[PDB]
Amino acid sequence: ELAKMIDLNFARKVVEENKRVKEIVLFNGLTTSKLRNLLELINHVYTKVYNSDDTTLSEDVRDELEYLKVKFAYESGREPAVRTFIEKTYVDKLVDVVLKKNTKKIFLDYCKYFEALVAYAKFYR
Amino acid sequence: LAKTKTGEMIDLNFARKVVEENKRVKDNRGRQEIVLFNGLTTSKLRNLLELINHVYTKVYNSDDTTLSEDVRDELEYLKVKFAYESGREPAVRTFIEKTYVDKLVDVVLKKNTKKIFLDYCKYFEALVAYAKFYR
Amino acid sequence: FKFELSNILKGARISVIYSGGDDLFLIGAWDDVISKALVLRKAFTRFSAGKLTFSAGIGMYPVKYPISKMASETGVLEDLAKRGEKNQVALWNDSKVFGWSQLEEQILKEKMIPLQEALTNSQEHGKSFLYKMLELLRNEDQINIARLAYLLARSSLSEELTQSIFAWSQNKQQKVELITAIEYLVYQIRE
Amino acid sequence: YSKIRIVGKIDVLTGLHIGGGGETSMIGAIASPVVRDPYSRLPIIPGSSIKGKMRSLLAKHIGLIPGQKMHNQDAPEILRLFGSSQKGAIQSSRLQISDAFFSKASQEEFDKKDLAYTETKFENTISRLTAVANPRQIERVTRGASFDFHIIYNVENINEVMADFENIKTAIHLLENDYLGGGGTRGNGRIRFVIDSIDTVVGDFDSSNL
Amino acid sequence: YSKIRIVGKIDVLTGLHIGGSMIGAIASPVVRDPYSRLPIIPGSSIKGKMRSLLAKHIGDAPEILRLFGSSQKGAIQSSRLQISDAFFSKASQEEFDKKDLAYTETKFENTISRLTAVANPRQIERVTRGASFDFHIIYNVENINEVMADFENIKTAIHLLENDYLGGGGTRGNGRIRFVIDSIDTVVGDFDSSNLSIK
Amino acid sequence: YSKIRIVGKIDVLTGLHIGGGGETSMIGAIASPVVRDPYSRLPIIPGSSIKGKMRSLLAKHIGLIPGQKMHNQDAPEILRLFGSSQKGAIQSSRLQISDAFFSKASQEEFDKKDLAYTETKFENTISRLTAVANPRQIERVTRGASFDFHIIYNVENINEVMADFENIKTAIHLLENDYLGGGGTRGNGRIRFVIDSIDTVVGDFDSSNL
């Protein structure tokens, strides 16, 4: 329940629409490696978030999430396919609302949404 | 990290705003090519980023929470190199003066903390990545 | 109830504790008990022109388990099954109150048999894959469904079976049906 | 009848992977998480792992009866110390080895240096046929971890106390050589029982010379 | 006649599997309150462990029989220790509801056989460390002359229990507990129990 | 039941890269860093890496059965030395190779020489259809550093201990001829072994011959 709706069903349906078959090509040609690198960054922040027990995001994880947004923008600039994927799934906007909420729960559902995106992207291939 | 004039803070979203402000479409011969910081390309940006990269690696390997004297002299040489490069090319001069990086290195020298230097490195990352993104 | 029931259970490891009056208390191997309960339901529908219905409860207990506890717990199962509307079969845990058609076809026919044939035909996957699917399905969190998809992506299973498993996991009733089919197959494939 | 505590510490010399379960793996996260006590969310060494490793090593040193199918067929010293469950002839265990928790000292030295308690070691599996890797993440425990191992010894036969403690010494020496937890064959598990403090908690037994 | 109430908490030092289904599930679930589903400590487990420890320290003994009841021929004695079930405390309920912590945990264990070196998985449910149970004990003062002695015995038992385990695989590091005797208040009779302490 | 402990030196002949993920990398910095002991923050040769490399080299040396889809099915000497997992035929692992940590001798040598134990190597992929290069930064371990590797061998079959230690020596030689860690086909991972001492820590076996 992040924003507008944005849920795991949104992830499955958006991967379905952006899927096109010629071979299977998703999000105008996004390889699984770029998505895996993005998920690796997600894992790097998520491990630190999970290890801490307090329900409020610390300053360190907030700075790491701003870094994650910057990395998202860099990846979009590097490859058009990653840019189209980021725009169609609005991941950076979810990062922004996670920053706005300052709650561990919102980050956790954001990570769940990202993992659902990865899972459905692999499944439809 | 630090503070600029008019009360504006130094952050990664500030780097986004700075790169956006210095973006002009500047169509030529019917072709839409994006120019940043009044003629600045990405080769100069990568050179400056590598200059930051060397000191970042040196500070990242060390476990000390206080900036070593060797890294302090690294940063002084960084200031000298930044001044030289800005003097060389007007576009790099506008880039340096608009992003306030030359003041930021002074702030990180005064703070004398590894964390502050890492934050400044992240800010320079935001600058270069966001310049790549808007292009 | 008395003469024909002996013919009904012929060939199965069943010891009829008592046909009594209308109620039937029967003890045997779990596989044979369930199969013969289904056959009994079908024969009971054939008899009396299908205007009579009967509710049954089936329970799983270890061999060393006391008989009194077996009787009491299967009785509570049948009480829960008859608590619903007309015929029900309260197989195993109270959360598995099924119907006769549902148990015979929707659980042991459309789901169990494809899983079995995939297991025996495949040379690379075994019981651990089924246990991973079961762990995914038992979890109530929605994200697990997506995880299931990922597993089914690298499962090397047939595409038709993959899509059917995904569809079953999406729906609630079909999810519990697939859970029951997986548990039954694991029980049948143990040791 | 006396109760003697052997509270001390365990110095991990390499990573320590005592796996667990009950948690589904988030995509790209740790495939095999280390066991953690849920309240503190810290890696622990369950007393079951310690007792099993000590018993297995001591049984190997003393000798296993050929064709030993059950743990209750070990040598009578092992059954006397670690416990046995035969039919009618049941021997109570004089050793009670508790879960070893993450030490507060190690917690402080890991909060300093900004170091995570566990280390997500990144591994692969090169197949013999196609020579293709297979990534794996194992949540080992870092080298600086110290665990507060807590053992209770119950003195039942006063005459065998000395021999039992010699057995314990041999087993802990064997454990100083052998690993604790899984993956020990591939670098994990090395430990050293450096820190000890033995005293009689309950009774009148002499614990100075133990 | 007098009855002395001993209330307190049973702090869990290692996951307590007091013992008491589907494939790939908890093979040995702990006992739960039938409605609340909260894990509890059966008072029979406490009474049995304390009786065993007191008997081992003492050594059928008259003290054990007079404290924990005897049905033997001739010597019929009413048990003086009525140890009620220890229920999950509200404070631990709140502390576990925060940080979204499950009341129990599922320890995965195995057993390497001495013959084939094969392992056998085992999902033991244990009440998670840091869980507090509101234990409750009643002492029946049948005779005023042997109160103190019995209390001494009780103390011994409790002391032993704090170095031993409660129900479960305690020798493998389960169920270590600590009694926090919140009070010892007389509820029936005029007997004064201020000077008696369990610990 | 005696444990024979091997302790020796692994001196890096060339740069050593053993990758590990989960580390945030700055733009233009090391893209693929080496594994680090989180405590010492120093390069480390994991015991898993050494054991896997040695087993792979030995199994290639003696031979691989065709269609070998699993590691359990292999030459039985490797099963005895390093372990097995086959259903109904589990063989205990007689070799427990542990992590190789950065020695104080080489660390102090580098400290006196004013050298960092790691190095950043610049490389690039030149696509040849367009002659377009894509650069990368790999971390390596500075040549001249030394690690202390510590193996423990359990003597279960006394008759074949000589053959088993001969196999260990042969595997060590195979690790000499080859690399360890990341892409050594391009020049990384060269190492050197210096066997410091072989002894019998626990038990009554004779270690003079070995």
Next chain:
Amino acid sequence: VVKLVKLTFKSPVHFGMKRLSDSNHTIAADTLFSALIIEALQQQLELSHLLNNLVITDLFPYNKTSYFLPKPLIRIEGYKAFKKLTYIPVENYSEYLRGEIDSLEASKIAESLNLGKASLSTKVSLQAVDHNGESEPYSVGNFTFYPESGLYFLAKGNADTIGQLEILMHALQYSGIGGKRSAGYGQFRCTIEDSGKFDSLLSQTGNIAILLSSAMASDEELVDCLEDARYLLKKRTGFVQSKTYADQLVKKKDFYAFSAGSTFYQKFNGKIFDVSDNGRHSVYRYAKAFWLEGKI
């Protein structure tokens, strides 16, 4: 003066009826009276008031909403729903007596009882492993009442008897009730208060009388009270619980008493039956009658 005593149970109760593996959710008046006698002996009080003048009912369920009563055994003008029905709330009692409760309402009433949940806890005995042999596992059936529920009863007697009952119930709170009261079961807290709805209900004259306690009359009363009456003879038995009765535990003489809810057209005052046999003290069994009159 009739006092409503409500017991809220802190721990699950055994309340066996014929064995240990079962768990009834209530107890008869004889069980409660024997508990009161044991308490009055322990507290060194005088048993004259409990015996000569005290009339108590069974333990009946009560929820957060309604106080339940036994279903009277009266003729019905479907049938299985009424047979399964056991308890009727006080509000729906006079309606049931007049027959206005149909099968659906009876089934809804039966489902409306939220007294609690009955479970079976399996226990072990390790008194043989220490010497030689194996552990002996047994099972105890317990019944955990829902948080707002409880078991109530009514007591009738003199003011002195009411005070003595209050003292005995205060001691019983910690003594425990039901079986296995020394192994963790049966602990409860009791509240004694004047009853308003029950006082109005019992001060009602009807054509029939309903037993509220397990009772039985002597020879003279039984020759007149058996006229076209519907009842249920329940077998009250058990071993003797005392220290000064015999060297080994000795069973009582078998007793049979009318169950609660039985309907009789003639009201009989019961007597306390001595079910002792070769013992040092008479083992009393409560069989006095608590009558509630109704119209059908």
